[PDB]
Symmetry: C6
């Protein structure tokens, strides 16, 4: 990653072993639960495209998701070569192509130069956005149940049902329709009390009333 | 977060992997026990709104509580807007800017390091801690009125359960009214000794009298 | 806490996660064994009152001890106010300012880095260590007068229990009690040694 | 390794105990799975040849693969000597002598020489060149430890499609040394070796379907 | 500790939590084996008298040994006062940290010429810990004798591990070379004396390698 | 150890608890296997003679090997005193006194003297000199501790060829103490099983180990 030397200077640093191991352990233990994405973005703070490819490469399993990730990266790189289609002025740098942002045709020197340019170009941030777009698709794919099939059990507490509802909703959406769907699929007892509270009630109010 | 450079300038640093893992471990091992809130505040020292959202996003389960937290944040942001309705006049943040939904990292750093500053991270953390206090209270299993000393339970263990329950029910907020409930719900043998101690006794004297 | 940077100035640092975790694990492992107190003083090196309240707040159990601690802190703050009554001059802290209930972080830093300093962090830690001493003495399972060498207990094990018990509660009186509560065999060997025997001599004469 | 100073100058730092122990654990746990190679490269960021030799020396077992690695490095060193022979004679003041293949591999060079090469203006990256040779030898080891051919990866009658694709592309990664390869034949081989139920659904999708569409169709 | 900064200056740092934890675990695992002493010396690198008292205070058990350590420290402190009778020079209680503030300890340690109160106190502690390792040593060196079926390597292992606790890690002496051969089993005893005098341990062990 | 500060100067730094615990662990878990030696050299990077003695002092067991190590250090120190005699007289201003063998081994030198030699211009690397002596003794320990001989390593009946080569070069590493050949190449083919040995000769002359293990893959 490109961090800050105490001279306010932007220098390149090696990815720490602690960060490498952290990202690896997150994937092995959490698979593609929705919270893996914000953990990836946080662990890749200030990363060059080379750092992002290093992080994706250290993943041992989940090679089906990784191939899907590549196919998303290639479709975003194609769009970049459209919206931002040779001599190079002194003190300046070339313009990046989609393969340069993904790190398939660019070097660490070219990436560092783009990210420390006084007219800067954040190829690491552009690449990370493409990666997160693909990770969203993978999280949607790995979600076992649709939001429509989340229904409160007969003897299941309302808290545990809302836990499953919003965790499913997080994976899918990687609003009034969600509120109507939440009350509609509560068990018939809890359901009636939710209808009796009236509309526009906060989630805190619904859960303390359904606590019986 | 925003930290101090050896050049004396407030600079932005990436949230460390050890801090991310410590916060995830706390939530997984303690859920919403009262002591989680001070640990959250300590682990988010100097945090920007983006850093606070990263910490909240790394929470795996408890999505009912997370949605409740969003509703509290939404209400605090709305009240902030109602309470905050020149060449070079800086644009001041709205509730959504403080919460980080409509503001960039660069804008958040601008407010926090301005002269005079607007501590959007400290403001946002105040809203989060309020919502976490609500969650801790709702998650508290037992009422303080139901904490009663067992016939063979040592007085110290009873007081441990009592004050830990009181902490969850008041969400760690600050009484002889608690002293009377503590004496009233002690078992008959200890209650007699506590009555004989006279009023206004310290807790240290009370537990030394009920040790035999 | 307050540490020094590379310009000779005292700068404020965020409390570190490894320090926080170390203090939590100390309370979970050692409860209120006497050695918990010096560990607290070492982990709170340079702490502001805000940092001291953070460390105490991260304790999960032992809430009976924590309430006792608040009562000790309250009495120390009241005594500070009694000894510092109100009369270019800097405002001086109240007892609640040292304890962090009525002072902001900037006020605590301003006091701790003033010339000359008012070390509200070290004053507060003093009050806290006073309270921990009472908790450790409370948690002490047995009185020192009841620590007695078993008829088949090695003299070294008896001395280990003796001095660990004395530490939680707190010299010629202790040497008298140590010899007096030994079993009749070791007691005879210790009395035959006479006065002026070190603990090393006493433990050697009874090592059999 | 050689890292940027807080002045901003390339200085030598000792290899850290955390980096050393990390590399030892990845080999004890993962052996020579394909993802071990990008982990080796990441843990040896900025490494000198001496550092690279230290990491290779901490491997306790797998000595057959380590001898193979030595032989691969020897062939790359000989090739370096054929393309970059050292001009004999005295070295100009303020200059470094030209490195031979054994200097890059760290057998006939000192730590002080390796530092002088890597921090020279312009730098001669003896550490990066040596790591390139090491990764070439590691590619061979990954293939040797992954015997199962991609042609023998077949979805079980009740194996979930996602697990079958996991085994497929993990086997392909070892065979192809983690090299990005766009090829239609390997994507038709994936459909070809799916089980009867999913293979019917995949053919009912039509040709030229993305992996996301295929895994969604066989999600049942 | 008093350690080098980055600007070439000696400054005071707080004792590290990782250092405190390492010292606690060492005592828990090894008790008072001889190798505990060099571990204590390494973990107390640059320590002030306050840091040394902090480390000793984190020891939970072993309070019999800790009281003996206090008695050794008091003897060394009393001998310091007798050898330094009355720039205020530190008394024994100042070196041990019972009557000295942290600022006074730093004032002595960083003076020119310095008075290293941390190193002096560490010497007293190590002298006291050596007496504890010796007293807690289970066996005397004279009772280490090679088993009839015991490999010679295993006998030499027990001999020097016992001699280390006995001679409290102090330094090939003639009596120890004769005692090692004298207490070997009659078979290897013959092979050793056949080699003659002044043989290396590598030659004694290769001969009796079995 | 001696490390570089932000003034480009070499300064003394305390040895870290991570380094001490790491060295203790590799000895407890791997004794004196050949891979222990490069681990000692990496963890002692930049070490003064005092640091090197600390690491050796943290070894609890293996005291027979540690006494052999002392006798190897004593013989290297005596050879240093023969080849580098100390000259009598006062020490020139701004210079260090000449180190003798016991100074390099840290028995008669102070830490400040060790720092003085290691940071002088030009530097006398007494830590690197001492470490070489230690590694010489440790190599003699790896060979004495080695159980099997390279001659007695023969391939089993149904044992895969890769497992036989694994055991072959691991034993060879202990016999040479990580020191590195048609001699070892012919001992590898001679001590194989008759099924693979036949195919090994048919491979031809000077075949690479890759070609050899692919020829006896099954
Ligand atoms: O919204 C999410 C993702 C999410 C998590 N759980 C879900 C269930 C369904 C679903 O569709 C999405 C999600 N993250 C939040 C942070 C957050 C997380 C949490 F767990 C609890 C909080 F209070 C806040 C966020 N990230 C980036 C920028 C802004 C905000 C944000 C948004 C709204 C407010 Cl009021 C404030 C900030
Ligand atoms: O009071 C609490 C929360 C709490 C914890 N346990 C409870 C059980 C029931 C309950 O209702 C609330 C709580 N925190 C304290 C710190 C503390 C924690 C502790 F454990 C023991 C101490 F001595 C002090 C605190 N935080 C922020 C600012 C000031 C103070 C404070 C307050 C009063 C004093 Cl005298 C001093 C400081
Ligand atoms: O040679 C060894 C020791 C060793 C290990 N295993 C053995 C089995 C028998 C045996 O006799 C000795 C040994 N280390 C190597 C590093 C290495 C280790 C490995 F595992 C695999 C590699 F490719 C390289 C080395 N160290 C210091 C300086 C230079 C070289 C070196 C040597 C030859 C090349 Cl081509 C390049 C560098
Ligand atoms: O491709 C691989 C190795 C790999 C892993 N699994 C495989 C299965 C078979 C196979 O032949 C090779 C491999 N590394 C990638 C990074 C990556 C890894 C991953 F897991 C998932 C991603 F989306 C991206 C890479 N490294 C260095 C430079 C560029 C790129 C690259 C390539 C293509 C795109 Cl679109 C973008 C970047
Ligand atoms: O005295 C204690 C607490 C203690 C521990 N165990 C006990 C059993 C009963 C009991 O009443 C109190 C205690 N700490 C000591 C440090 C120490 C700890 C130890 F374990 C062994 C040592 F040699 C020294 C200390 N701390 C702060 C300042 C000065 C000294 C001090 C005191 C006397 C000497 Cl001669 C030197 C320094
Ligand atoms: O001597 C010891 C203690 C010791 C350990 N084991 C023992 C068994 C019986 C016994 O009486 C004492 C001891 N430490 C040594 C270091 C060492 C440790 C080791 F294990 C193996 C080595 F080669 C060297 C040492 N420390 C401080 C200063 C100088 C030296 C020193 C001494 C002699 C040489 Cl030639 C070189 C340095």
């Amino acid at each position: 990653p490109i961090v800050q030397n105490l001279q306010g200077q932007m220098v390149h640093q090696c990815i720490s072993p602690r960060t490498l191991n952290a990202w690896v352990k997150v994937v092995e233990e959490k698979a593609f639960s929705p919270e893996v994405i914000p953990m990836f973005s946080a662990l890749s703070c200030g990363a060059t495209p080379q750092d992002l490819n290093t992080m994706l490469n250290t993943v041992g399993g989940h090679q089906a998701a990784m191939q899907m990730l590549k196919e998303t990266i290639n479709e975003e790189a194609a769009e970049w070569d459209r919206l931002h289609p040779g001599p190079i002025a002194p003190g300046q740098m070339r313009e990046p192509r989609g393969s340069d942002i993904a790190g398939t045709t660019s070097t660490l020197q070219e990436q560092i130069g783009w990210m420390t340019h006084n007219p800067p170009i954040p190829v690491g941030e552009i690449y990370k956005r493409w990666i997160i777009l693909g990770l969203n698709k993978i999280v949607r794919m790995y979600s076992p149940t649709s939001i429509l099939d989340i229904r409160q059990g007969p003897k299941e507490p309302f808290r545990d049902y809302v836990d499953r509802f919003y965790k499913t909703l997080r994976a899918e959406q990687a609003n009034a329709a969600t509120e109507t769907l939440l009350v509609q699929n509560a068990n018939p007892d809890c359901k009636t009390i939710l209808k009796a509270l009236g509309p526009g009630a906060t989630l805190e109010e619904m859960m303390t009333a359904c606590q019986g």
